[PDB]
Design an enzyme around this catalytic site. Structure first.
Site, PDB file in Angstrom:
ATOM      1  N   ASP A 121     -31.708  -1.413   8.764  1.00 19.74           N
ATOM      2  CA  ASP A 121     -32.260  -0.523   7.742  1.00 19.74           C
ATOM      3  C   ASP A 121     -31.359  -0.390   6.518  1.00 19.74           C
ATOM      4  O   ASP A 121     -31.463   0.594   5.776  1.00 19.74           O
ATOM      5  CB  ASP A 121     -32.551   0.864   8.325  1.00 19.74           C
ATOM      6  CG  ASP A 121     -33.542   0.818   9.465  1.00 19.74           C
ATOM      7  OD1 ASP A 121     -34.366  -0.119   9.495  1.00 19.74           O
ATOM      8  OD2 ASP A 121     -33.494   1.714  10.334  1.00 19.74           O
ATOM      9  N   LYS A 124     -10.755 -10.283  18.930  1.00 19.83           N
ATOM     10  CA  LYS A 124      -9.815 -10.689  17.896  1.00 19.83           C
ATOM     11  C   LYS A 124      -9.429  -9.434  17.129  1.00 19.83           C
ATOM     12  O   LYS A 124     -10.300  -8.748  16.584  1.00 19.83           O
ATOM     13  CB  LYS A 124     -10.428 -11.734  16.963  1.00 19.83           C
ATOM     14  CG  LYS A 124     -11.087 -12.913  17.671  1.00 19.83           C
ATOM     15  CD  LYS A 124     -12.589 -12.688  17.865  1.00 19.83           C
ATOM     16  CE  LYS A 124     -13.291 -13.930  18.417  1.00 19.83           C
ATOM     17  NZ  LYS A 124     -12.758 -14.357  19.739  1.00 19.83           N
ATOM     18  N   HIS A 178     -11.629 -11.898  24.789  1.00 20.41           N
ATOM     19  CA  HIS A 178     -12.277 -12.521  23.647  1.00 20.41           C
ATOM     20  C   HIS A 178     -12.108 -11.753  22.342  1.00 20.41           C
ATOM     21  O   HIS A 178     -12.428 -12.301  21.282  1.00 20.41           O
ATOM     22  CB  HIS A 178     -13.773 -12.709  23.937  1.00 20.41           C
ATOM     23  CG  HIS A 178     -14.489 -13.536  22.914  1.00 20.41           C
ATOM     24  ND1 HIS A 178     -15.431 -13.007  22.059  1.00 20.41           N
ATOM     25  CD2 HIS A 178     -14.384 -14.848  22.595  1.00 20.41           C
ATOM     26  CE1 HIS A 178     -15.889 -13.962  21.270  1.00 20.41           C
ATOM     27  NE2 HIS A 178     -15.268 -15.088  21.573  1.00 20.41           N
ATOM     28  N   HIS A 205     -20.751 -18.296  13.851  1.00 23.80           N
ATOM     29  CA  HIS A 205     -19.920 -17.632  14.842  1.00 23.80           C
ATOM     30  C   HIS A 205     -19.889 -16.127  14.636  1.00 23.80           C
ATOM     31  O   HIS A 205     -19.166 -15.428  15.353  1.00 23.80           O
ATOM     32  CB  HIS A 205     -18.494 -18.194  14.815  1.00 23.80           C
ATOM     33  CG  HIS A 205     -17.681 -17.827  16.017  1.00 23.80           C
ATOM     34  ND1 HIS A 205     -16.631 -16.936  15.965  1.00 23.80           N
ATOM     35  CD2 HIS A 205     -17.773 -18.224  17.308  1.00 23.80           C
ATOM     36  CE1 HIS A 205     -16.108 -16.805  17.171  1.00 23.80           C
ATOM     37  NE2 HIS A 205     -16.783 -17.576  18.004  1.00 23.80           N
TER      38      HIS A 205
HETATM   39  O1  LIG Z   1     -12.805 -22.682  19.437  1.00 26.94           O
HETATM   40  C1  LIG Z   1     -13.312 -23.641  20.008  1.00 26.94           C
HETATM   41  N1  LIG Z   1     -14.693 -23.824  19.887  1.00 26.94           N
HETATM   42  C2  LIG Z   1     -15.584 -22.921  19.116  1.00 26.94           C
HETATM   43  C3  LIG Z   1     -16.865 -22.610  19.893  1.00 26.94           C
HETATM   44  N2  LIG Z   1     -16.478 -21.867  21.139  1.00 26.94           N
HETATM   45  C4  LIG Z   1     -15.567 -20.780  20.676  1.00 26.94           C
HETATM   46  C5  LIG Z   1     -15.429 -19.607  21.576  1.00 26.94           C
HETATM   47  C6  LIG Z   1     -16.781 -19.111  22.172  1.00 26.94           C
HETATM   48  N3  LIG Z   1     -16.739 -18.146  23.342  1.00 26.94           N
HETATM   49  C7  LIG Z   1     -17.376 -16.889  23.375  1.00 26.94           C
HETATM   50  O2  LIG Z   1     -18.074 -16.361  22.503  1.00 26.94           O
HETATM   51  N4  LIG Z   1     -17.056 -16.320  24.657  1.00 26.94           N
HETATM   52  C8  LIG Z   1     -16.211 -17.234  25.409  1.00 26.94           C
HETATM   53  C9  LIG Z   1     -15.604 -17.187  26.720  1.00 26.94           C
HETATM   54  C10 LIG Z   1     -14.823 -18.272  27.157  1.00 26.94           C
HETATM   55 CL1  LIG Z   1     -14.041 -18.194  28.852  1.00 26.94          CL
HETATM   56  C11 LIG Z   1     -14.594 -19.420  26.383  1.00 26.94           C
HETATM   57  C12 LIG Z   1     -15.191 -19.465  25.095  1.00 26.94           C
HETATM   58  C13 LIG Z   1     -16.005 -18.383  24.587  1.00 26.94           C
HETATM   59  C14 LIG Z   1     -17.598 -20.263  22.760  1.00 26.94           C
HETATM   60  C15 LIG Z   1     -17.749 -21.414  21.765  1.00 26.94           C
HETATM   61  C16 LIG Z   1     -12.365 -24.608  20.821  1.00 26.94           C
HETATM   62  C17 LIG Z   1     -10.955 -24.447  20.847  1.00 26.94           C
HETATM   63  C18 LIG Z   1     -10.092 -25.318  21.561  1.00 26.94           C
HETATM   64  C19 LIG Z   1     -10.645 -26.393  22.288  1.00 26.94           C
HETATM   65  F1  LIG Z   1      -9.853 -27.214  22.964  1.00 26.94           F
HETATM   66  C20 LIG Z   1     -12.045 -26.590  22.291  1.00 26.94           C
HETATM   67  C21 LIG Z   1     -12.879 -25.700  21.561  1.00 26.94           C
END
Ligand SMILES: O=C(NCCN1CCC(n2c(=O)[nH]c3cc(Cl)ccc32)CC1)c1ccc(F)cc1
Length: 586
Positions: free
Chosen positions: A421, A128, A126, A414
């Site tokens: 503080d 970046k 996860h 996100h």
């Molecule tokens: O970017 C998308 N949506 C934004 C909201 N999501 C983003 C990532 C987020 N996230 C974590 O914070 N930890 C995760 C562990 C895993 Cl295995 C998977 C996602 C995790 C969760 C919420 C998206 C992209 C392509 C698609 F076809 C459909 C949606």
């Protein structure tokens, strides 16, 4: 590097580091594009999702500043780009990492892409990360992906060869997470939702760039995952995927660096890398324990309060212990928790959301106010109604015009940032849940940023020397959230004094009241059961009934802050009944 250092981290704190924070993706992507342009030898990229045709500067008038075109130009000059993509379980997620790899590697032979993992698993890569020449590193919550670009305007509409293009979000870059999931990612310039009826969902995130030693520490993390992933498959064992080696610590700059002490933190497991580490979690707990005045938390998820063998991290407990300690000592202490009003999953909220929306809301509400482990239940037991003085849970929402009438949509938080503080900040990809913080699951990155240089400020009306990096970031967060551009009379110097805290609570309460009355949007405290929800959504909102009367009442909205509805579907259970671990959502 031999031992573990502060917070059991693989890297020690680095004093004299210049670091620049970013809020939203407009500045982060433009800074990334400028750093990519100045690359001379190496570029390292890790992404949960990387969209190859994404533009790093808007509005796009050419193929310059497109991520694939920039890396192809840099590779033609001899720069080696090594990219680590997370391999989704296909047709169960939908980022199409296969297409991203294929698109990237065909650009130039100097661009090598690896994907991990191949084995069936629940956990993901996860973090970046973008590192240029092992000296300049970007990290935070922003993937180089669709929908992430945004600014403080948080526009809901984008209606406007690209020589005179006016569209800020082109094709698949225009999206609403709750409305529809992404489809056909190999056709990037085709819309998949209708711009004339469906508004985009704004993306709020936090990122940071660091220079020098911490970028070497982050590059060290990339190199370890690269060489480890080389031994995971038969094909990456080939010499077309060379081993990567770090440059010695003993050895351009981005405009905006504040001199700080930066310590890299990470969550890794022997499945993700070769060792176990949860220094991000360790830094979170210590920063909360050693906080003296306030906590500002902005996170996509807030699932904690180690309870019954399901949630294990103790971030919620440390917050409770700190609030109880401040209440016992009777000192002025505040905790600001900012969360998205809904989890970022496709679902029909008018029906109560899908399984994902309900599962995340269950553990979120179990963390905050429902059950005997929740923060508020434990706080009410010790101080009663006085809990409202120490903790505030809010979300963000904005409104616009689409189709001749007002429209509303939540701003998706996100970010994964903690401020303490006005001196200490944590920025990274780690959510406040077991998946990010435990280390045994998803791999995450973060940095702990401590200020060594201060400014005159206020703390509960007293003279306070606040750190320059943290104070500037916290003020910018407060100003955009509260709409300080239109209300310059508001004083953001003191973050804990009672006059400001009540203004914070009043604006969040007032705004949530106007959005409910005008839009009847969800989530809301008005629908405490799925039965009330079915009757609630049957009524047409005033926004479409009388748009003139809607706009007249939307003039009283100040900023984007709205109170988080803690009683939404309060009478329901919210947990999917087949053979699946509940740690998928924890
Ligand atoms: O970017 C998308 N949506 C934004 C909201 N999501 C983003 C990532 C987020 N996230 C974590 O914070 N930890 C995760 C562990 C895993 Cl295995 C998977 C996602 C995790 C969760 C919420 C998206 C992209 C392509 C698609 F076809 C459909 C949606």
């Amino acid at each position: 590097f031999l031992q573990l250092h502060r917070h059991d981290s693989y890297a020690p704190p680095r004093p004299g580091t210049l670091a620049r924070w970013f809020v939203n993706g407009a500045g982060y992507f433009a800074a990334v594009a400028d750093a990519i342009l100045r690359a001379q030898e190496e570029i390292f990229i890790t992404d949960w999702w990387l969209s190859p045709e994404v533009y790093l500067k808007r509005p796009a008038h050419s193929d310059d500043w497109r991520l694939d075109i920039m890396l192809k130009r840099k590779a033609e000059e001899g720069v080696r780009v090594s990219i680590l993509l997370f391999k989704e379980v296909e047709l169960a997620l939908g980022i199409n990492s296969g297409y991203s790899k294929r698109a990237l590697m065909l650009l130039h032979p100097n661009i090598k892409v690896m994907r991990h993992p191949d084995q069936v698993t629940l956990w993901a890569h996860h973090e970046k990360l973008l590192v240029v020449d092992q000296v300049v590193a970007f990290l935070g919550g922003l993937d180089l992906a669709y929908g992430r670009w945004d600014d403080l305007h948080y526009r809901l509409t984008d209606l406007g060869d690209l020589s005179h293009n006016q569209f800020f979000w082109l094709g698949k870059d225009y999206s609403n997470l709750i409305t529809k999931d992404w489809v056909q990612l190999d056709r990037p310039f085709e819309d998949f939702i209708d711009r004339e009826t469906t508004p985009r969902m704004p993306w709020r995130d936090v990122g940071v760039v660091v220079h020098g030693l911490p970028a070497r520490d982050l590059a060290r993390h990339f190199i370890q995952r690269w060489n480890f992933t080389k031994t995971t498959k038969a094909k990456y064992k080939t010499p077309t995927y060379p081993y990567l080696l770090p440059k010695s610590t003993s050895t351009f700059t981005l405009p905006g660096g504040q001199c700080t002490t930066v310590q890299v933190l990470r969550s890794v497991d022997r499945w993700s890398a070769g060792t176990l580490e949860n220094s991000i979690l360790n830094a979170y707990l210590h920063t909360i324990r050693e906080s003296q005045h306030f906590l500002y938390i902005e996170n996509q998820f807030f699932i904690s309060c180690s309870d019954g063998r399901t949630v294990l991290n103790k971030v919620g407990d440390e917050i409770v212990d700190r609030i109880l300690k401040a209440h016992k000592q009777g000192w002025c202490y505040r905790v600001y928790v900012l969360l998205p009003l809904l989890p970022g999953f496709e679902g029909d909220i008018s029906t109560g959301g899908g399984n994902s929306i309900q599962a995340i809301l269950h553990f979120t509400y179990r963390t905050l106010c429902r059950g005997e482990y929740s923060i508020l239940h434990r706080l009410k037991a010790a101080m009663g109604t006085a809990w409202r003085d120490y903790i505030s849970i809010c979300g963000l929402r904005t409104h616009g015009e689409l189709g001749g009438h007002p429209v509303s949509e939540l701003i998706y938080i996100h970010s994964k940032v903690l401020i303490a503080d006005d001196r200490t900040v944590i920025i990274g990809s780690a959510n406040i849940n077991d998946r990010s913080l435990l280390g045994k699951r998803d791999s995450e990155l973060a940095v702990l940023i401590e200020d060594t240089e201060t400014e005159p400020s206020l703390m509960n009306g007293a003279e306070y020397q606040a750190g320059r990096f943290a104070l500037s970031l916290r003020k910018h967060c407060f100003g955009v959230i509260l709409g300080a551009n239109t209300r310059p009379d508001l004083d953001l110097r003191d973050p804990i004094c009672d006059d400001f805290f009540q203004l914070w609570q009043d604006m969040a309460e007032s705004n949530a009241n106007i959005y409910e009355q005008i839009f009847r949007c969800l989530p809301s405290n008005a629908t405490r059961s799925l039965r009330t929800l079915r009757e609630y959504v049957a009524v047409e909102p005033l926004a479409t009934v009388s748009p003139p009367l809607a706009r007249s009442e939307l003039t009283q909205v100040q900023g984007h802050l709205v109170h988080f509805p803690l009683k939404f579907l309060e009478d329901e259970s919210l947990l999917p009944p087949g053979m699946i671990p509940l740690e998928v959502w924890t």
